[PDB]
């Protein structure tokens, strides 16, 4: 987990 | 305790058991009795004996006057739609055919049928059948156009405020603007002739139409204009309708101090009147959870969609778009809440449910089907990473690739190239290309994502910063362009604490990325410079984590009407 | 060029011949022995008037560029008109 929450 | 049944509940079960012989005479019973006979048929499960009577418009006019037992009608109506028979499309067509025949009548018969249309079209729109409610209103609208006096102009604007609402749940936005322009034609004609109409409900719809098309700059302009016309004489249903849409435009405006007072007043105003079971109360919770998810209050946002879904799962039956919309947002909220944990099995069930419902009741090329399709794809790509099976990793990640592109096409067809929703799919597709090992392709998607959002939203905004962090992780973790990523991480850091402070729980993927940023370019002194801030983020997050649930945060009577409006308007 | 369309109750509904050729039965009634009157002892006058109203509705609205409005068939007349539509094959 590296891209934060998906928009 | 074994209490005997009332004679009413016994005579009900004795005329329902003799329904075939007494079907002719039941239709002559009073409205309170007649609905209780028909609801007993639903209780006995004899839907065929029931849908044979709801398909007639005159009976569905009688069982629509039982306002106390409307919550039972929605569950009885939704059961018919899933049972087979298209009782919504038959009623809408049977009304339009009957409405088209009284065009050459007086203003007494016409007003009788227009009021039938406003409670029928007000029911299909309430149950989610927007494509079938519009056909009722479009017939009610052409009754008001026949007579061109001051009396009927107030109903033509009463249809156009509702037509503007059934054309947004149906995602027919390009007809919505023409509806609003036609409303002003019937508004200026009425307003000029010595009778000013309340332009408050109508501007509230534009606060959701222009919000839907990502015109947040235009949404807030009509957000202010909607609440300037709020008057204590307005119905509570209208007033709570303006507040929830006003909150959604204010939250996306990234100003949260004025947003909370609008929606927390809306939840209270939709709980003291409508109660904790009316669908309008759950409708307000759905928009209330929109506020919670954008203010990083994700912990209790799931608990407010689950409350919103559970109300709709009880009033609106099994396969309904309103149930599906709640399934969509709950799946997204569970996606965001459990992103760190990585376990998506309840979230996948909700996202799969929202597609199993919408694909059944909507065409394959519907905009609302696209937004519910991206949520499953976001969940699938995370399962396609967490799972250790390479065969499962490739195929599930490919399935999420077809969903974004299908979702992007539907958004790109109606919202155009330059919109936030179109760019939101670029960022999601950019994150997917990162997981698909297509780092070259993942570069150009985020660049197109940020450039569209930066051009529309502005140089500094929360949506832009969250998209940059997607690109920052690309340049840092798997493309090794640390110099390019150095400015991107810092760009999101300033915006992230601009509206949330250092305790923003999304900064965990921003601070940790900075640690890996400096791990491969030397300068280990700054590694510890960001290492304590991560502990500072840990301290500033868990301490404020302990907070009461948002359901009791509104409490009982927190504020008063015509006070939140004045407080918001002056600011 | 005009067709004498009498009714069961001796009510005449004359109309242009090209309008009366929409129904295949009237076209067959004109053919053979006897642009003159035709016996209509079964169909009543109140429903044959709507048939004649449909005749000018069908011919005028052929290949129309605009959307054709629904032909009004009143509920009290619908069942009797339907048999007239089948008998006339209109």
């Amino acid at each position: 987990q590296k891209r934060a929450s998906g928009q | 305790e074994w209490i005997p049944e009332t004679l009413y509940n016994t005579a009900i079960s004795a005329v329902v058991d003799n329904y075939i012989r007494s079907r002719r005479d039941i239709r002559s019973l009073p409205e309170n009795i007649q609905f209780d006979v028909y609801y007993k048929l639903y209780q006995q499960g004899r839907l065929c004996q029931l849908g044979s009577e709801f398909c007639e418009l005159e009976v569905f006019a009688k069982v629509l006057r039982a306002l106390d037992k409307r919550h039972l009608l929605h569950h009885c109506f939704q059961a018919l739609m899933d049972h087979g028979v298209k009782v919504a499309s038959v009623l809408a067509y049977s009304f339009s055919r009957r409405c088209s025949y009284i065009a050459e009548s007086d203003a007494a018969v016409k007003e009788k049928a227009i009021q039938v249309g406003f409670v029928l079209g007000g029911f299909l729109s309430d149950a989610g059948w927007y494509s079938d409610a519009e056909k009722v209103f479009l017939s009610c609208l052409q009754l008001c156009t026949l007579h061109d006096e001051m009396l009927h102009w107030f109903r033509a604007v009463e249809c156009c405020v509702r037509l503007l609402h059934v054309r947004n749940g149906n995602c027919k936005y390009h007809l919505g603007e023409e509806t609003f322009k036609l409303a002003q034609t019937y508004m200026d004609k009425l307003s000029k002739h010595g009778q000013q109409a309340n332009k408050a409900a109508l501007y509230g719809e534009l606060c959701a139409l222009l919000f839907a098309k990502s015109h947040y700059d235009e949404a807030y302009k009509w957000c202010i204009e909607a609440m300037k016309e709020i008057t204590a004489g307005l119905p509570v249903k209208v007033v709570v309708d303006v507040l929830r849409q006003a909150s959604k435009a204010c939250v996306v405006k990234r100003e949260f101090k004025k947003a909370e007072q609008l929606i927390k007043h809306a939840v209270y105003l939709a709980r003291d009147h409508f109660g904790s079971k009316h669908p309008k109360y759950s409708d307000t919770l759905l928009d209330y959870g929109f506020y919670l998810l954008n203010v990083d209050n994700i912990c209790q946002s799931v608990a407010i969609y689950q409350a919103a879904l559970d109300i709709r799962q009880s009033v609106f039956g099994g396969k309904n778009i309103h149930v599906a919309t709640a399934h969509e947002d709950l799946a997204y909220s569970s996606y965001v809440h459990q992103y760190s944990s990585g376990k998506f099995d309840n979230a996948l069930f909700h996202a799969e449910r929202a597609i199993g419902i919408i694909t059944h009741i909507l065409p394959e090329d519907h905009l609302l089907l696209a937004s519910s399709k991206r949520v499953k794809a976001l969940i699938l790509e995370e399962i396609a990473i967490d799972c250790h099976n390479k065969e499962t990793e490739q195929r599930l990640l490919q399935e999420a690739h077809d969903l974004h592109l299908s979702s992007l096409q539907l958004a790109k067809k109606a919202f155009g190239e330059f919109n936030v929703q179109t760019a939101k799919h670029y960022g999601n597709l950019g994150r997917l290309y990162q997981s698909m090992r297509k780092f070259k392709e993942a570069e150009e998607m985020h660049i197109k994502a940020i450039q569209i959002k930066e051009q529309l939203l502005g140089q500094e905004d929360y949506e832009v910063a969250l998209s940059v962090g997607h690109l920052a992780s690309l340049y840092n973790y798997d493309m090794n362009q640390y110099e390019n990523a150095e400015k991107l991480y810092l760009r999101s850091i300033a915006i992230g604490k601009k509206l949330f402070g250092e305790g923003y729980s999304g900064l965990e993927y921003d601070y940790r990325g900075l640690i890996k940023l400096y791990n491969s370019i030397g300068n280990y002194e700054k590694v510890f410079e960001y290492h304590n801030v991560l502990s500072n983020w840990n301290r500033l997050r868990d301490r404020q984590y302990s907070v009461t649930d948002a359901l009791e945060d509104v409490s009982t009577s927190p504020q008063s009407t015509e006070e939140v409006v004045q407080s918001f308007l002056i600011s | 060029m005009y067709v004498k369309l009498i009714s069961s109750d001796g009510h005449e509904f004359i109309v242009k011949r090209e309008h009366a050729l929409t129904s295949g039965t009237i076209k067959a009634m004109l053919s053979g022995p006897g642009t003159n009157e035709v016996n209509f002892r079964e169909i009543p006058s109140h429903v044959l008037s709507k048939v004649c109203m449909y005749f000018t509705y069908k011919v005028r609205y052929t290949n129309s560029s605009t959307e054709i409005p629904e032909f009004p068939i009143a509920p009290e007349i619908a069942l009797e008109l339907l048999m007239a539509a089948n008998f006339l094959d209109c």
């Binding site: - | 090329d365 195929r395 490919q398 399935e399 690739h401 077809d402 592109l405 299908s406 992007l408 096409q409 539907l410 790109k412 067809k413 670029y426 597709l429 392709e441 150009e444 998607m445 197109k448 | -």
Partner: protein, 83 residues
Amino acid sequence: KKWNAVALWAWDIVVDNCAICRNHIMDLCIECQANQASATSEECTVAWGVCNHAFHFHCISRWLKTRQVCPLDNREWEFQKYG
């Protein structure tokens, strides 16, 4: 004795829509429209099938990566006429 004329050429399909991406058949597929509309444009071929359902080549390749049947008619997919 001298002439000059235009030619509005189009693919032989009359369905007019790529059933996987819903874009117009003559326009670029949704995959080409996503990243670059000119660099990948020249290879946006259409592929026919034994069922005679012409689709975008990139779209039908994406479809064949996951599933193994024609989208419209659920028969098996065998290319015949790459355009």
